[PDB]
Design a binder for this molecule. Structure first.
Ligand SMILES: NC(=O)OC[C@@H]1N=C(N)N2CCC(O)(O)[C@@]23N=C(N)N[C@@H]13
Length: 825
């Protein structure tokens, strides 16, 4: 296997060439491909001439556009603020679950708040080993009959690991730095070198604070404790021999890391525009670069075309002003060098390129027109900037090879992150670890919506869409056509977009491409984790139309289904707590009332043991035919050769709500179904023979507390009620979407004033297009002061299906859409 790294300069090619020699990764061979600039490497990766390079966040954005179609795959992790430990968060969530779901696992945390490596389930006596994330090591379950397993100690903290590694087996790495750790195992804020006498500050994860390095014999530095803000900061660095302030920059000479860099271009320019130091607001006044050419007298801005913006660079011949180290003033350290050599009056870079030493001739130019010392960048800066990232082709044909190589090179301690030949070659010299990004991340989710739009805003006038119009997202062609019919009558309040599926609609809404979509329950966990909110919900209750006629009035019964455990009045010995091994009937695999809710509760109370093994003989269409979940099934439509048992079809006699009812009455101890199935097929409501004369009073429903009740009390004796379907949108668009939909509904709902013009809740083009056809009306979501998960799902459903946890991953989009960002206010 090979990885071809694209380099942008001779220095970097030489360093990459050194790694080809010095770094030995079995099975994966590195190679180095030279191009003359960041942009020529981007094109090489797009063409397959190379596979990977490291890019500044600004170029990550540029590379994500159709010209190059690259995506970020690997980056250094960062932190915004101190967080609860996972174990303590987990305890809090599980303890907040529905107390009526008894016997749930509550994690055991240690005196540092981490997971004990041995975890146990009180009500079942099972124990198992966990990793530091609290995830079970599969295959370590031991039963109460046995003693608790022996589990490897948890991995050490970075500091204690780095301490042990620095000791490297010996009694002391004599003459070498050994980190000093606190009791929680984080880095002490002040670190000192035990041989040179130098001291400096680090943040809680051990990154050095620039401007704090102090030689022995000087007053100790002042170090902040509990510093978990590890985002990088754009800064303007000046010499203390000058005296102008930030607002007096017009006409000065400047050094920038580069035209396409966030710290060298986007962050300063954004501030120039907000302060009105640049006469410029939109693409009507020209290009940003041209306006910047009028602002400064002479600069070095690698990659610029305007002449005075290259005037201060010092690259030889065609190398002058290239986005490449062949230009000595390129990049963070190049712009600092340009200040240091007095080609500029100010350099624009980020805190990680500031001098380490406290004492010296440099300080920061704050945008509030004061100056502050190097180590105050957190209060003297031009904004946090995004992380930088390794990129490859969107297709991801080499992603695994690139990740594997960098993981092994780092394990082996290869010299990735420094070099004799120069600074920031291949990777930033400040980098300490590169980790894989979420598999579905793209530039939008990596940079985050604020920096993504801010960088877009410099390249084109972004016309923000009207708050008086809802762009509805459709998932198939008939929906799109119903939506074009709505738009035609809507007077412009409705417009349409198209996507392949509900999750891509969620993505469009996150990215500002659509405004609203109706979601099945099964997509709501993903949509709420990504940060959308219910705006209105589908009210399905055919009996009481009062909530629709007089909106706002309190709702007696929302009308959603209730999942119940149905058994015969005869079978008196079956309770909830003894269903194990019995014979059960399920509408079909994947049904929420017939399967998801039952499977969730069983997993919750039996250590995630397969619902397949929990029951003896059961019928659940959609399972394997040789499995015990199909043995009770029959099929026999026309009693044909291919009776299609467990068929997910009406060819299976036991499929669906009625079908699960048959399976119970004929050969079953329990059926999992909506609370309506029994009534719908007893009291002779079903003319068929098996249901004829069945009567409702002959059955009852199991309650979670072991008791029972008659089928009529499904509201107080159910496995869980389902929440209604919801129309979701962005938080800041909820009020608009509510306002527009409730107006549309006054015209085109079931009692709409113009319901002859258009009907929201039906169509000739197909069934349940945009909304479910049985919707009575849409009702504004009355947001409560609680976790939205519990607010939207209801506590019972939340804990039964998701263990009342924010950590389930039913869609691979969740890690990408919850990725945290380095954004400003
Ligand atoms: N009557 C009624 O059932 O209203 C439903 C409405 N929307 C939900 N999905 N919910 C589930 C839980 C809940 O409290 O019923 C609720 N949460 C809020 N905020 N209002 C309710």
């Amino acid at each position: 296997r090979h990885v071809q790294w694209c380099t942008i300069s001779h220095l970097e090619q030489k360093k990459c060439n050194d790694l080809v020699g010095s770094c030995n990764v079995p099975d994966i061979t590195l190679a180095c491909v030279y191009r003359s600039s960041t942009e020529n490497c981007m094109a090489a990766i797009k063409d397959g001439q190379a596979d990977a390079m490291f890019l500044d966040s600004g170029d990550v954005y540029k590379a994500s556009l159709d010209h190059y179609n690259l995506k970020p795959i690997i980056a250094e992790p960062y932190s915004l603020h101190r967080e609860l430990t996972k174990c303590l968060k987990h305890r809090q969530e599980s303890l907040g679950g529905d107390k009526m779901v008894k016997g749930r696992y509550i994690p055991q945390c240690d005196e540092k708040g981490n997971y004990h490596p041995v975890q146990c389930h009180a009500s079942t006596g099972y124990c198992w080993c966990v990793n530091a994330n609290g995830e079970k090591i599969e295959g370590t379950n031991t039963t109460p009959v046995q003693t608790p397993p022996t589990c490897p100690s948890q991995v050490l903290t970075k500091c204690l690991k780095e301490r042990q590694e620095a000791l490297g087996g010996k009694r002391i790495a004599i003459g070498r730095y050994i980190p000093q750790c606190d009791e929680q195992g984080n880095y002490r804020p002040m670190q000192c070198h035990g041989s040179t006498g130098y001291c400096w500050c680090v943040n809680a994860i051990g990154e050095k604070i620039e401007g704090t390095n102090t030689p022995p014999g000087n007053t100790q530095p002042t170090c902040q404790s509990h510093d978990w803000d590890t985002c990088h900061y754009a800064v303007a660095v000046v010499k203390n021999s000058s005296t102008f302030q930030f607002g007096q920059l017009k006409g000065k000479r400047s050094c920038h890391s580069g035209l396409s860099k966030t710290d060298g271009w986007n962050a300063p320019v954004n501030v120039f525009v907000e302060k009105k130091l640049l006469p410029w607001d939109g693409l009507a006044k020209g290009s940003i670069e041209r306006a910047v050419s009028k602002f400064f007298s002479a600069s070095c801005i690698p990659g610029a075309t305007e002449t005075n913006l290259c005037k201060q660079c010092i690259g030889e011949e065609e190398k002058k002003c290239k986005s490449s180290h062949d230009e000595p003033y390129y990049g963070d350290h190049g712009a600092f060098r340009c200040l240091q050599e007095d080609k500029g009056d100010v350099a624009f870079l980020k805190n990680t390129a500031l001098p380490d030493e406290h004492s010296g001739v440099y300080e920061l130019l704050c945008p509030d027109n004061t100056r502050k010392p190097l180590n105050k960048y957190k209060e003297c800066n031009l904004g946090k900037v995004p992380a930088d990232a390794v990129v490859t082709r969107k297709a991801g044909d080499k992603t695994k090879d690139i990740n594997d190589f960098l993981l092994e090179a780092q394990k082996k301690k290869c010299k990735l992150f420094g070099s004799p030949h120069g600074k920031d070659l291949m990777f930033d010299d400040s980098t300490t670890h590169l980790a894989p990004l979420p598999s579905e991340i793209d530039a939008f989710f990596f940079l985050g919506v604020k920096w993504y739009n801010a960088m877009k805003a410099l390249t084109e006038d972004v016309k923000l869409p009207s708050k008086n119009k809802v762009r509805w997202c459709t998932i198939n062609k008939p929906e799109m056509m119903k939506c074009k019919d709505w738009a035609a009558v809507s007077g412009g309040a409705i417009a349409c977009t198209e996507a392949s599926c509900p999750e891509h609609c969620v993505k469009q809404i996150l990215k500002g491409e659509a405004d609203a979509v109706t979601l099945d329950v099964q997509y709501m966990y993903m949509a709420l984790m990504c940060g959308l909110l219910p705006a209105v919900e589908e009210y399905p209750n055919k009996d009481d139309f009062h909530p629709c006629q007089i909106p706002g009035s309190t709702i007696k019964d929302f009308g959603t289904k209730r999942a119940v455990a149905l058994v015969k009045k005869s079978n008196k010995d079956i309770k909830w707590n003894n269903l194990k091994g019995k014979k059960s009937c399920h509408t079909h695999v994947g049904d929420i009332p017939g399967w998801v809710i039952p499977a969730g509760l069983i997993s919750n109370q039996n250590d995630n043991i397969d619902i397949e093994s929990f029951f003896g003989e059961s019928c659940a269409p959609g399972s394997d035919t040789n499995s015990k979940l199909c043995k009770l099934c029959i099929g026999d439509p026309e009693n044909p050769k291919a009776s299609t048992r467990c068929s997910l079809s009406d060819k299976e006699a036991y499929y669906g709500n009625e079908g699960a009812f048959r399976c119970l009455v004929e050969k079953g101890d329990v059926a999992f179904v909506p609370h309506t199935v029994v009534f719908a097929n007893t009291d002779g409501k079903n003319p068929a023979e098996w249901a004829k004369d069945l009567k409702s009073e002959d059955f009852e429903i199991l309650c979670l507390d072991g008791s029972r009740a008659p089928v009529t009390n499904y509201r107080g004796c159910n496995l869980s009620g389902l929440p209604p379907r919801a129309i979701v949108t962005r938080e800041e668009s909820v009020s608009d979407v509510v306002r527009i939909l409730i107006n549309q509904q006054s015209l085109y709902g079931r009692n709409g004033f113009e319901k002859d013009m258009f009907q929201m809740f039906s169509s000739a083009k197909g069934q349940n297009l945009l909304f479910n056809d049985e919707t009575q009306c849409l009702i504004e979501f009355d947001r409560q002061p609680k976790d939205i998960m519990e607010d939207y799902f209801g506590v019972r459903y939340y804990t039964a299906v998701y263990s009342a946890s924010r950590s389930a991953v039913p869609s691979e989009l969740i890690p990408a859409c919850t990725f945290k960002h380095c954004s400003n206010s």
